[PDB]
Design a protein around this ligand. Structure first.
Ligand SMILES: NC[C@@H]1O[C@H](O[C@H]2[C@@H](O)[C@H](O[C@@H]3[C@@H](O)[C@H](N)C[C@H](N)[C@H]3O[C@H]3O[C@H](CO)[C@@H](O)[C@H](O)[C@H]3N)O[C@@H]2CO)[C@H](N)[C@@H](O)[C@@H]1O
Ligand SMILES: [K+]
Ligand SMILES: [K+]
Ligand SMILES: [K+]
Ligand SMILES: [K+]
Ligand SMILES: [K+]
Ligand SMILES: [K+]
Ligand SMILES: [K+]
Ligand SMILES: [K+]
Ligand SMILES: [K+]
Ligand SMILES: [K+]
Ligand SMILES: [K+]
Ligand SMILES: [Mg+2]
Ligand SMILES: [Mg+2]
Ligand SMILES: [Mg+2]
Ligand SMILES: [Mg+2]
Ligand SMILES: [Mg+2]
Ligand SMILES: [Mg+2]
Ligand SMILES: [Mg+2]
Ligand SMILES: [Mg+2]
Ligand SMILES: [Mg+2]
Ligand SMILES: [Mg+2]
Ligand SMILES: [Mg+2]
Ligand SMILES: [Mg+2]
Ligand SMILES: [Mg+2]
Ligand SMILES: [Mg+2]
Ligand SMILES: [Mg+2]
Ligand SMILES: [Mg+2]
Ligand SMILES: [Mg+2]
Ligand SMILES: [Mg+2]
Ligand SMILES: [Mg+2]
Ligand SMILES: [Mg+2]
Ligand SMILES: [Mg+2]
Ligand SMILES: [Mg+2]
Ligand SMILES: [Mg+2]
Ligand SMILES: [Mg+2]
Ligand SMILES: [Mg+2]
Ligand SMILES: [Mg+2]
Ligand SMILES: [Mg+2]
Ligand SMILES: [Mg+2]
Ligand SMILES: [Mg+2]
Ligand SMILES: [Mg+2]
Ligand SMILES: [Mg+2]
Ligand SMILES: [Mg+2]
Ligand SMILES: [Mg+2]
Ligand SMILES: [Mg+2]
Ligand SMILES: [Mg+2]
Ligand SMILES: [Mg+2]
Ligand SMILES: [Mg+2]
Ligand SMILES: [Mg+2]
Ligand SMILES: [Mg+2]
Ligand SMILES: [Mg+2]
Ligand SMILES: [Mg+2]
Ligand SMILES: [Mg+2]
Ligand SMILES: [Mg+2]
Ligand SMILES: [Mg+2]
Ligand SMILES: [Mg+2]
Ligand SMILES: [Mg+2]
Ligand SMILES: [Mg+2]
Ligand SMILES: [Mg+2]
Ligand SMILES: [Mg+2]
Ligand SMILES: [Mg+2]
Ligand SMILES: [Mg+2]
Ligand SMILES: [Mg+2]
Ligand SMILES: [Mg+2]
Ligand SMILES: [Mg+2]
Ligand SMILES: [Mg+2]
Ligand SMILES: [Mg+2]
Ligand SMILES: [Mg+2]
Ligand SMILES: [Mg+2]
Ligand SMILES: [Mg+2]
Ligand SMILES: [Mg+2]
Ligand SMILES: [Mg+2]
Ligand SMILES: [Mg+2]
Ligand SMILES: [Mg+2]
Ligand SMILES: [Mg+2]
Ligand SMILES: [Mg+2]
Ligand SMILES: [Mg+2]
Ligand SMILES: [Mg+2]
Ligand SMILES: [Mg+2]
Ligand SMILES: [Mg+2]
Ligand SMILES: [Mg+2]
Ligand SMILES: [Mg+2]
Ligand SMILES: [Mg+2]
Ligand SMILES: [Mg+2]
Ligand SMILES: [Mg+2]
Ligand SMILES: [Mg+2]
Ligand SMILES: [Mg+2]
Ligand SMILES: [Mg+2]
Ligand SMILES: [Mg+2]
Ligand code: NA
Ligand code: NA
Ligand code: NA
Ligand code: NA
Ligand code: NA
Ligand code: NA
Ligand SMILES: [Zn+2]
Lengths: 78, 81, 48, 111, 258, 102, 50
RNA sequence: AACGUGUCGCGAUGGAUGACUUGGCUUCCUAUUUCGUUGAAGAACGCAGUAAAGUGCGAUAAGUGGUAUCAAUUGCAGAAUCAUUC
RNA sequence: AGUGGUAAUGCGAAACACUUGCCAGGUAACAAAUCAAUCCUCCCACGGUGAGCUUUCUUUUCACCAUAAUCCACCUUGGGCCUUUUUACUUCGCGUUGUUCGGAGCGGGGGCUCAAGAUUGAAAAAUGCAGCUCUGUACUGUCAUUUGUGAGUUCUGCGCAUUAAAGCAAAAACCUGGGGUGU
RNA sequence: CCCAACUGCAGACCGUACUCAUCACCGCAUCAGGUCCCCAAGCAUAGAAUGCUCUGGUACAUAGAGAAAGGUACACUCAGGGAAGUCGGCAAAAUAGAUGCGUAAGUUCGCAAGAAGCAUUGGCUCUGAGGGCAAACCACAAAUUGCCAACUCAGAACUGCUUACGGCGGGGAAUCCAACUGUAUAAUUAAAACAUAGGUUUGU
RNA sequence: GCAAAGAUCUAACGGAGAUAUACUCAACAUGCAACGUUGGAUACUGGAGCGGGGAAGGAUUUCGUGCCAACGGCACUCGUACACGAGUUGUUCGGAAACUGAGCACAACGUUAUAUCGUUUUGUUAGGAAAGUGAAGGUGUGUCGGCGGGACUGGCCAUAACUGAAAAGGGGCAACAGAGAACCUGGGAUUAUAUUCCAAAAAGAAAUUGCAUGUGGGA
RNA sequence: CGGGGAAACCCAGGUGGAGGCCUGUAGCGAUGCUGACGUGCAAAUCGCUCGUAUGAUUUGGGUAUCGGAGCGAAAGACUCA
């Protein structure tokens, strides 16, 4: 795993052809955008809630977005 | 002591299966079969045990090719005109 | 085995796991790509 | 009720190359993980004293193969092979021995 | 009867040299063109101990006379050899401890070691710890040199045969009492399987001439003929004399009037 | 899944309070040798480390100079001082003697 | 244990395959003489030792 | 009394005997009758719709081809033809 | 067609690049005891959840309170070294539990580096465990969500390293340099 | 053509069940024998001694009834005497930990030695001693002021014994032999035998 | 005789294994004994374990269902018995590919009436010509830097061919505890396998090979 | 680190942790009961007791040496009861 440092790099990461999905994780005091690339998972940590909303709407709709949630055993069975 | 107790001290194997004859007579450490002397080119054969010779002699197996060639010899190597 | 699966059933095997059974025969677990449905392939094969 | 562990690879002998450490997993299980062997590190020649060289890290095989050259040498001459005092000795030895040879040769030529 | 232990050892088997952990044979460098005409200067790089040998060994680094490389010979270090010492080997080498010179170039009365019995044999005499040879005289007419060997015998050798100046290092080793069977056990660990020793009278007569009897005794004289076959040649072999020596130890070995 | 059976440390902890107050450790209760229970080497290690720690602190705080420290350092190694208080009392006496000479 | 040559494993496999009872319909053949497998093996009675 | 003994009749246990003999032993004879690097003998693993051993066979695997024969094989099952050859 | 620092030695986005033509070292590669001791174990305080006991006592007893590799950034301890001050040892100083050390450079100041950690994040709660709520689902909302100058522990400090007339395998593979190529 | 950061595709072969033993191996057997390695909790205690215990495992090893004689036991006791028994103190009894004091002949000066002997030990309530941490060029009683962990030892008063778990040397005076540690007749001999260091001789 | 390893008791359920009866007669005095599972109770093993994993050895004894003829020296409804059906999943774990060690002995040579004998690591086969590998160069192709007027010549690097520096000491085996070795947890993923199974939110996060493309920096 | 001494040297306290050193587990062995058993659990076992337990120590795998021969700290021991 690699941590993205700035927003400019994050948009560059999302612009890669091998970035298949972006996992949006909502922590109680931060928001984490985890881009799943070919080799590495790239995480951008945004402390500001309003700034995270700006970034979330900014993400180019070509790449699939996944709202990270807890999945129960029943949903993941079989 | 010798006997029952010492029977439990016997570990490992002196002999394993032989590639040539499959008799479990292949000495692992000396890398040679006690039954057929593999990997020496020729086999063991001793007249003091004719019984051993006749266990291993020709005709104790399939005679896969010998049957065919014997028929051909008996028929004088017949071939179509 | 991957090549044979493509030739005989026109499906792409993404992973083949093999084991030699205690009876002496080789068994293969062949996972097909998500594009192919294993159940549909099994129906066509006839094992169902 | 303390936990007890087992060898998880297929080698069950406590040799120097099979040392283990006890690791508590996120699943709250106690398991044994293998300690990687360590290298003694880059040293001066044995006949010169066999001391570790400053500025050179102790890397083993794959780590040494993939690490950058600076991790195993210095910019000085004979970096990664000889120490600074050894390098200075050879430099001084080179100059002074040749100078003495020149003086002797000139003296014979003068005679 | 059965084979005697002394005969069994001749088969080799479990009585051979424990050569593992030994550094290799110790020798002078090859008697090449440079040695026969000039000299070769080396540097002592390390003084090392080999299992089964009392004398210290010296690793001496030479340049290759014909190729761009180093040689790294291994010799028996004389007493006083030190790391960094320059070793001179050749016809023109100076007379100093550690140098290797032809015997004809060495002054009479000098003390030498690592002496070549034959020219080019790379050292066969005076090699054990603390031992040395003494140069008696030179005879230029026949080109021979007379030496006093450590045993006391005098031996003549060609003057082209080389020798090393000094005495073998590690002398005085046999002066310390062992005091323990265990110390002997460790002493022979690096040499061979020859210890402990069972007396012949303690064995049975089937395996030794001295065996048996209702008393522990040799019932026949223990001095046996030189021509006795193996298995019968045990005891004091071809002894010219027996009993406590009094009034002077004569030089042992075969008699060579030359 | 039933819970594990109870193994209680209550009696041990009550006994620990008693032994902390000094009970149940007299002559009659001792089975191992005195060195086995409390090695003399460990006692000496603790004492010497304490004395050297005190000497380093005094030297750093300039209470004693290098010459006094060196003399005390050797004598501490020589088993001169039984404890920290004994060393401090000797140091006080040395300071008093130097003051009179001053 | 875990280790064995594949050749040893194959021989053990064949011995497993041979360790079977005689099929019932064999006993109904015209000139049948076989009732039960005379070469049945149990791992605790006789050792193959491969 | 009871155990036990003896005899006869009838049963059990036990597989001798007779009859039976596709086996052995022994003696004769006949001959375009003597293996293999063109991979033998021997060893191993497999092959049947059903198949452990044995037999036969070798991924063409209880067999392909050809000739002759002339209505099967057979425990069950299967099977175009009921047949100048196909 | 590398570069900075008085120096110990530093700097990596792909000319600081190629080197099995050749040469030389290093890793692999081995070692007591004492004393410190890692991961973990045990035991204490600390606080939550549930459970046991409660004629009478017990702010109690028991269980649990977990964070894998791989990475990013970069205070403690021990060793080696550099620079500076050397009028540092005249009837000396530093340091270990311990058999030491120093003008062949001790101690003090300021630095370089190595080895173990500590810490900062990414991974990583989305996991795990227990409890609990509600609605017939192996359903579903939710809450819990660390301190020890304690005792063990050979990972490590640790070797030109043990009794020794005992001195403690080798090689593949890999690393660095010397030369040369680039020129 | 050489590199850097990526990326794309592909990563073959064999082993993998179970056992490792008071039932899975060897000993004719599911045989009280034998068989290498790793992980190893709590209390007492010097503790991997020994006793008991949470976790895990188990009640599987023909059972029931049940004071005959005689037996076996990894079971005890016995008045008075105390080796009178016996080839022989065989067997059993006895000694017992820790701490202080004290300890003979002889001796290769190392030992002999735990020589021999004497004394103390519980419980409870106290007292003393043994530390860490933090704080304002001269000399400066931070020579005191707070807070705190983990233990050990010593000394008192009071109050007990039926001398009471386990575990744990009997000692002394001499003779013979071997210097010692070791080795050694698997299955009747462990010794004074063998070995040993030391000494001497022989061949070279 | 089936007595070492202490010890079992109780209820319910399961089972043909019962509470099984001429007359008399209320039940005791006329169906005894012994079982598998679950829950209780009592105790044992006491971490140097009747605990959890491996090597050697064994080779299906593993798992589920059925089943009680024979076998488990008593018993069984139970079983490591019997019958039937199933189970062992790897780029990273172990081995091999691919290291050397004590050693082994193919070639070579020698010996022997006869090889089925000897030598074969003290750096090392064999009277012994055992190297087929290739540095600098000359000759063509392609990738480049530089000059002059896409090409043309001094210069770089790869691609094939003529030579020809340099390299002495043939070919192999022998360690599943030495050397070497790129993967970790989580799981509702099994009746039995898992650092081996999980598929788009791979529960997932990595590491490491071999070839390629494109991007960028150099030639 | 102290105490004596003209000197040579001697005396005392601590530190340190040596030994084919001692007590004693595991381990490796096997003394006595001439115990049990002696158609045994066992063609050599069981119990208590006992030797040793940092060394000439114990042990796994691999490898080397045999049949008038191998091996033997030596008992004619051992070389698959
Ligand atoms: N009766 C006394 C005994 O008879 C015995 O012998 C008797 C039997 O051996 C013999 O055989 C009889 C036969 O007689 C009579 N007629 C028919 C009967 N089947 C036979 O009996 C036989 O067959 C039956 C079954 O069928 C078996 O149970 C029985 O064991 C068997 N002996 O009859 C004999 C009686 O005369 C013995 N010889 C002897 O020990 C003694 O005398
Ligand atoms: K062959
Ligand atoms: K015969
Ligand atoms: K299968
Ligand atoms: K171990
Ligand atoms: K067999
Ligand atoms: K009693
Ligand atoms: K004396
Ligand atoms: K003996
Ligand atoms: K299983
Ligand atoms: K039965
Ligand atoms: K012996
Ligand atoms: Mg025998
Ligand atoms: Mg054995
Ligand atoms: Mg063998
Ligand atoms: Mg072998
Ligand atoms: Mg596989
Ligand atoms: Mg190392
Ligand atoms: Mg190191
Ligand atoms: Mg560097
Ligand atoms: Mg030899
Ligand atoms: Mg002797
Ligand atoms: Mg004798
Ligand atoms: Mg004789
Ligand atoms: Mg005699
Ligand atoms: Mg005598
Ligand atoms: Mg005599
Ligand atoms: Mg002490
Ligand atoms: Mg196994
Ligand atoms: Mg068996
Ligand atoms: Mg096997
Ligand atoms: Mg069949
Ligand atoms: Mg074909
Ligand atoms: Mg026809
Ligand atoms: Mg080293
Ligand atoms: Mg090694
Ligand atoms: Mg000074
Ligand atoms: Mg250490
Ligand atoms: Mg498996
Ligand atoms: Mg398994
Ligand atoms: Mg086990
Ligand atoms: Mg058993
Ligand atoms: Mg048998
Ligand atoms: Mg205690
Ligand atoms: Mg115990
Ligand atoms: Mg205990
Ligand atoms: Mg049993
Ligand atoms: Mg029984
Ligand atoms: Mg009495
Ligand atoms: Mg009396
Ligand atoms: Mg008497
Ligand atoms: Mg009497
Ligand atoms: Mg009497
Ligand atoms: Mg008498
Ligand atoms: Mg007695
Ligand atoms: Mg006296
Ligand atoms: Mg003795
Ligand atoms: Mg005597
Ligand atoms: Mg001893
Ligand atoms: Mg003894
Ligand atoms: Mg005996
Ligand atoms: Mg005996
Ligand atoms: Mg005896
Ligand atoms: Mg009876
Ligand atoms: Mg009975
Ligand atoms: Mg019993
Ligand atoms: Mg009995
Ligand atoms: Mg009734
Ligand atoms: Mg009933
Ligand atoms: Mg218990
Ligand atoms: Mg166990
Ligand atoms: Mg089962
Ligand atoms: Mg029965
Ligand atoms: Mg079965
Ligand atoms: Mg070798
Ligand atoms: Mg040789
Ligand atoms: Mg040769
Ligand atoms: Mg190999
Ligand atoms: Mg290994
Ligand atoms: Mg691997
Ligand atoms: Mg897991
Ligand atoms: Mg779970
Ligand atoms: Mg399993
Ligand atoms: Mg001892
Ligand atoms: Mg002892
Ligand atoms: Mg043993
Ligand atoms: Mg008896
Ligand atoms: Mg009896
Ligand atoms: Mg009896
Ligand atoms: Mg005799
Ligand atoms: Na006489
Ligand atoms: Na300085
Ligand atoms: Na089956
Ligand atoms: Na996967
Ligand atoms: Na054992
Ligand atoms: Na021989
Ligand atoms: Zn064979």
């Amino acid at each position: 795993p690699r941590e993205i440092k700035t927003l400019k790099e994050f948009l560059a990461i999302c612009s890669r052809k091998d970035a298949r999905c972006v996992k949006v994780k909502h922590n109680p005091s931060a928001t984490k955008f985890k881009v799943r690339c070919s080799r590495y998972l790239y995480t951008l940590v945004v402390n500001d809630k309003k700034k995270a909303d700006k970034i979330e709407r900014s993400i180019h709709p070509s790449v699939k977005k996944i709202a990270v949630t807890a999945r129960s055993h029943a949903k993941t069975n079989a | 002591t010798k006997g029952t107790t010492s029977m439990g001290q016997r570990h490992g194997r002196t002999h394993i299966l032989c590639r040539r004859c499959g008799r479990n007579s292949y000495h692992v450490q000396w890398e040679r079969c006690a039954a057929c002397a593999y990997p020496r080119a020729s086999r063991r054969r001793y007249n003091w045990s004719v019984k051993a010779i006749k266990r291993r002699r020709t005709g104790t197996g399939r005679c896969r090719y010998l049957k065919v060639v014997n028929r051909r010899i008996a028929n004088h190597f017949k071939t179509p005109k | 085995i991957k090549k044979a699966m493509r030739k005989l059933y026109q499906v792409k095997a993404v992973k083949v796991n093999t084991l030699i059974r205690p009876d002496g025969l080789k068994k293969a677990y062949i996972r097909l790509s998500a594009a192919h449905d294993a159940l549909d392939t099994a129906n066509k094969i006839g094992l169902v | 009720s303390c936990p007890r562990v087992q060898y998880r690879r297929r080698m069950h002998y406590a040799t120097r190359g099979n040392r283990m450490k006890m690791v508590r997993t996120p699943g709250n299980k106690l398991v044994m993980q293998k300690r990687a062997k360590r290298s003694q590190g880059i040293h001066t020649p044995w006949v010169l004293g066999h001391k570790r060289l400053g500025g050179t890290k102790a890397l083993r095989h794959i780590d040494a193969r993939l690490a950058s050259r600076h991790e195993k040498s210095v910019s000085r001459a004979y970096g990664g092979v000889l120490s600074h005092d050894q390098v200075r000795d050879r430099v001084v030895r080179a100059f002074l021995v040749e100078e003495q040879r020149i003086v002797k040769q000139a003296l014979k030529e003068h005679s | 009867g059965k084979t005697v232990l002394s005969c069994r050892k001749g088969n080799g088997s479990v009585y051979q040299v424990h050569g593992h952990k030994r550094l290799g044979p110790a020798k002078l460098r090859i008697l090449d063109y440079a040695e026969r005409h000039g000299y070769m200067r080396g540097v002592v790089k390390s003084i090392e101990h080999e299992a089964g040998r009392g004398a210290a060994l010296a690793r001496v680094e030479f340049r290759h006379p014909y190729k761009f490389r180093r040689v790294k010979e291994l010799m028996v270090a004389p007493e006083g050899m030190f790391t960094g010492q320059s070793v001179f080997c050749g016809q023109k080498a100076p007379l100093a401890i550690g140098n290797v010179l032809p015997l004809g170039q060495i002054t009479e009365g000098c003390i030498v070691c690592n002496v070549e019995a034959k020219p080019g044999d790379r050292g066969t005499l005076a090699r054990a710890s603390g031992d040395y040879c003494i140069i008696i005289s030179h005879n230029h007419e026949t080109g021979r040199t007379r030496l006093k060997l450590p045993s006391g015998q005098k031996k003549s050798v060609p003057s082209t045969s080389r020798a090393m100046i000094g005495i073998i290092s590690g002398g005085g080793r046999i002066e310390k009492p062992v005091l323990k069977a265990g110390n002997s056990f460790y002493r022979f660990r690096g040499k061979r399987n020859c210890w402990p020793k069972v007396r012949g009278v303690a064995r049975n007569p089937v395996e030794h001439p001295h065996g048996g009897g209702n008393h522990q005794h040799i019932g026949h004289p223990s001095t046996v003929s030189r021509h006795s076959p193996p298995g019968q040649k045990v005891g004091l072999i071809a002894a010219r004399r027996t009993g406590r020596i009094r009034g002077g130890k004569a030089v042992k070995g075969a008699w060579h009037p030359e | 899944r039933k819970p594990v059976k109870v193994h209680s440390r209550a009696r041990w902890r009550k006994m620990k309070e008693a032994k902390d107050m000094g009970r149940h450790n007299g002559v009659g209760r001792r089975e191992g040798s005195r060195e086995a229970r409390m090695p003399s080497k460990e006692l000496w290690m603790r004492r010497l480390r304490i004395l050297r720690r005190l000497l380093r602190k005094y030297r750093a705080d300039k209470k004693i100079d290098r010459h006094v420290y060196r003399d005390l350092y050797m004598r501490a190694k020589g088993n001169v001082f039984r404890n920290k208080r004994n060393l401090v009392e000797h140091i006080h006496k040395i300071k008093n003697e130097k003051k009179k000479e001053r | 244990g875990r280790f064995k040559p594949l050749a040893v494993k194959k021989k053990y496999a064949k011995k497993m395959n041979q360790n079977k009872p005689v099929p019932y319909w064999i006993r109904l053949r015209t000139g049948n003489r076989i009732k039960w497998n005379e070469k049945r093996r149990h791992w605790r009675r006789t050792k193959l030792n491969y």
